[PDB]
Amino acid sequence: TLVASVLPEDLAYAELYSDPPGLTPLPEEAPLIARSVAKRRNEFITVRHCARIALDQLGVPPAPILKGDKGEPCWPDGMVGSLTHCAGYRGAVVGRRDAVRSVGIDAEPHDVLPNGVLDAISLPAERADMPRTMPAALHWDRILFCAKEATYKAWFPLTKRWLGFEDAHITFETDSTGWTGRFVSRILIDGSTLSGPPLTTLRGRWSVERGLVLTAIVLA
């Protein structure tokens, strides 16, 4: 699997590269996408079908995955997880809370960012430092965006505070293979959590594979 490249008996994952036809949401999930468009409908369903494959293999029976604070996914009790999707990928990674404090993942196509995006999602330092050490064959701007989204998704559940794109400083290192590596996200705002020790440094992994950028953060 692709997501295995960016992950370190309490963690499961599942991914699919297309929308399997005929899949249907759970009954009390249905009103969430009654008015949604077809393309949104498919990835809503496919990613929750991936989520329940992983959740079942952690002895958790299928349960509805609703959306809460700023659309945040909701999980069965004692559970945490993360959902992601893009043009050719649907994936979920889930974990039990005591072993996994939080999960954050993202998947993106390995293409240049649309015009004007690199500036909103990034700091003057990240833009000077990343081109010095990232391999020439990589879209460091897109990989930066993927790492940014994977950080807020792992950050937000533990603080329920909004993490702007310029409240996190991400530094990258490239593994000797050249297409994979890992990063450190440093929080520039208060790291007060609702529970647990403060959180200011998040370590995650990044990978480029099959034309796709994958990132994941697992906070033990």
The nearest distance, CB 65 to ligand D16, in angstroms, is 8
Amino acid symbol at 202: L
d(C-alpha 133, C-alpha 99), whole Å = 34
Answer yes or no whether residue 75 interacts with ligand D16 by CB under 6 A. no
Find out whether 158 and 82 touch, Cβ atoms under 8 Å. no
**String marking each residue 161-190 x if it binds ligand D16 according to CB under 6 A:** -xxxx-------------------------
Min separation Cβ 164 and ligand D16, Å: 6
Residue 156 is a binding residue for ligand D16 (CB under 6 A):
yes
Asked if 24 interacts with ligand D16 (CB under 6 A), we say no
Residue 85 touching ligand D16 (CB under 6 A): yes
CA 151 to chain centre: 7
Q: Contacting ligand D16 (CB under 6 A), which of 7, 13, 15, 44?
A: 44
- CB within 8 A of 22, min separation 6: which ones? none
The window from 94-102, 108-116, 151-159, 197-205 that contacts ligand D16 (CB under 6 A) reads: 151-159
Structure tokens, 97: 């809370």
Bridge partner residues of 187 (DSSP): 168
Within 10 angstroms of residue 37's Cβ, the number of other Cβ atoms is 8
CB 12, CB 55: distance < 8 Å: yes
Give 67's DSSP letter.
B
Is 160 assigned to a binding site?
no
Which CB atom, from 165 or from 183, has the smaller least distance to ligand D16?
165
Is 40 a known ligand-binding residue?
Answer: yes
The beta-strand segments (E) located in 10-149 are 11-16, 79-86, 89-96, 102-109
- Quick one: which segment of 4-12, 82-90, 134-142, 189-197 binds ligand D16 (CB under 6 A)? 82-90
The answer to whether 108 is annotated as binding is yes
Q: Does 83 bind ligand D16 (CB under 6 A)?
A: yes
Is position 52 an interface residue for ligand D16 (rule: CB under 6 A)?
A: no
213 binds ligand D16 (CB under 6 A): no
Would you state the torsion angle of the CA atoms of residues 118, 124, 129, 131, taken in this order, to the nearest 10 degrees? 40
Q: Which residues bind ligand D16 (CB under 6 A)?
A: 44, 47, 67, 70-73, 82-85, 152-153, 156, 162-165
